[PDB]
Design a protein around this nucleic acid. Structure first.
Lengths: 131, 178, 165
RNA sequence: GGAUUAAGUGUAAUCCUCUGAAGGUGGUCUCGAGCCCUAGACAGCCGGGAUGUUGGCUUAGAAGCAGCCAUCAUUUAAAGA
């Protein structure tokens, strides 16, 4: 489902837990996960569209890898020249690649999490976003 | 060698290596004799003396002497006091001082809360003040810092116990203040 | 055990397989460790293992003191880095009191002439400065291999110097 | 003349004979090596140890610090996912 959660806000039962909690989502993972990325932009209402599979695994959004990387980097643009320009563009945490890969995963068909991260990294490489 | 001049407000006047201090707080004396050393004399100002000697040996001395004085100076004017709290696990401790260090004199009672009081000794000229409230502070002071020192200490140590472990019980009184 | 009247050379030759049989097998695993083949020699970081003594470590001495050595070389991820080399072999055979030759101390028995000591063990001998067993790789860590040999030495009768790369 | 030693080490050439091998000491003296310093060191010393965010994954947990991936951005005098 979808809800609008404050940037750095988490586990509380009344707001969060029973909505999704009955869906099969595990609140603990989401609270930390959501709060984690949401740290860079705090105080901002980010509506989350959580998607839960039969696995009861889930992902949520800000929609595209380039966009996701852009936001993770917190930079609006991609480097003019990805290979040459790097730090200028920006950087993202290795974990963040994992984060994006995980959210994107329903879309991606990587065999493993490592593969998915590699897929996202490929996009980042083009953008001039270093990991 | 070195020369220490101080303070006004406190006199000196040492003869035949006894040494002294003056006031206004009470005076302390300290023999300060060791090896061919001058045993510093007051030089119509303040005392400081060196003996023609060698290197380290005398040097470890006539350094120490310097520190014994200069802490005799401050122990005569504005004395030295050490201060610290008592407190631990259930039931309080009874600290109180009766004249003299002697058994059943110097404080402490129920350590944890044991029977039989255990405490001594007190130094020559030290004063044991007591707690502000029922019990939660001690002040130990006196002119000499060498009696006042191991009075508050030897009152902390008189809580130390070699048994279970310090960790489990943390009774005792410690003078955190210096 | 203990090794006393074992590693001091106060004898002379042989090993000689012709002459001797019933030699015990060495309990010293392979003297080729780490990845062999490729020349480890291209490496930063260097060597160790200098005896600093006289001689004759037994195979009992080297074989648990060397793989003991290797064991804490395992830290560098199994098959990934360094080659370990051992130098000298335990050729040298020793004999021990079989009461028939002479008298008194070992290599002497009972009677005069007669039973030389019966074969029991072999030990390589070394000189004042020889490299007992060396090899290295790039500075993997501070020097795990240097840590190796700490343990390696401390089971040698000799006092071994680490020796810097 | 000079220096070391604080253990009564030692005051024991050789050796059945004089043991000592792979306990401790910021007592003090002497010698060497590395790094840091007036773009100010140590104390060097004193005081302090940002927001998204518990980054993504993994995991019972995994919150800077088991492990894998990423290592951006913000607010900054400054502060690493």
């Amino acid at each position: 489902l979808y809800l609008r959660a404050v940037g750095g806000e988490v586990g509380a039962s009344a707001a969060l837990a029973p909505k999704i909690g009955p869906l099969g989502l595990s609140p603990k993972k989401v609270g930390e996960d959501i709060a984690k990325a949401t740290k860079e932009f705090k105080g901002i209402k980010v509506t989350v569209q959580l998607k839960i599979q039969n696995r009861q695994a889930a992902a949520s959004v800000v929609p595209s890898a380039s966009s996701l990387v852009i936001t993770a980097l917190k930079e609006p643009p991609r480097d003019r020249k990805k290979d040459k320009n790097v730090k200028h563009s920006g950087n993202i945490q290795l974990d963040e690649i994992i984060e994006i890969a995980r959210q994107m995963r329903d879309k991606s068909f990587g065999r493993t999490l490592a593969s998915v991260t590699k897929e996202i990294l490929g996009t980042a490489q083009s953008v001039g976003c270093r990991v | 060698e070195q020369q220490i001049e101080v303070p006004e407000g406190v006199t000196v006047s040492i003869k035949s290596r006894i040494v002294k201090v003056v006031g206004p707080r009470g005076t302390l004396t300290k023999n300060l004799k060791h090896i061919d050393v001058t045993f510093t004399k007051v030089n119509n100002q303040l005392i400081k003396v060196a003996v023609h000697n060698g290197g380290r040996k005398h040097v470890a001395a006539l350094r120490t002497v310097k520190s014994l004085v200069d802490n005799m100076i401050t122990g005569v004017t504005k004395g030295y006091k050490y201060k610290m709290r008592y407190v631990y696990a259930h039931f309080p401790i009874n600290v109180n001082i009766v004249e003299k260090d002697g058994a059943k004199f110097i404080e402490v009672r129920n350590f944890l809360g044991d029977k039989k009081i255990r405490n001594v000794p007190v130094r020559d000229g030290v004063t044991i003040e007591f707690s502000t409230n029922v019990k939660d502070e001690i002040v130990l002071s006196g002119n000499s810092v060498e009696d006042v020192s191991q009075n508050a200490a030897d009152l902390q140590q008189i809580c130390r116990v070699r048994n279970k472990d310090i960790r489990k019980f943390l009774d005792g009184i410690y003078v955190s203040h210096k | 055990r203990p090794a006393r009247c074992y590693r001091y050379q106060k004898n002379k030759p042989y090993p000689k397989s012709r002459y001797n049989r019933a030699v015990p097998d060495s309990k010293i695993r392979i003297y080729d460790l780490g990845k062999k083949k490729a020349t480890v020699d291209e490496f930063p970081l260097c060597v160790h293992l200098v005896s600093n003594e006289l001689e004759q470590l037994s195979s009992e001495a080297l074989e648990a003191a060397r793989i003991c050595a290797n064991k804490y070389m395992t830290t560098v991820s199994g098959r990934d880095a360094f080659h370990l080399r051992v130098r000298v072999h335990p050729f040298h055979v020793l004999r021990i009191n079989k009461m028939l030759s002479c008298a008194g101390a070992d290599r002497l028995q009972q009677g005069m002439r007669g039973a030389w000591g019966k074969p029991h063990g072999l030990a390589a001998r070394v000189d004042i400065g020889q490299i007992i067993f060396s090899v290295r790789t790039k500075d993997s860590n501070k020097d795990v291999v240097v840590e190796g040999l700490r343990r390696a030495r401390y089971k040698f009768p000799g006092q071994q110097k680490i020796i810097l790369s």
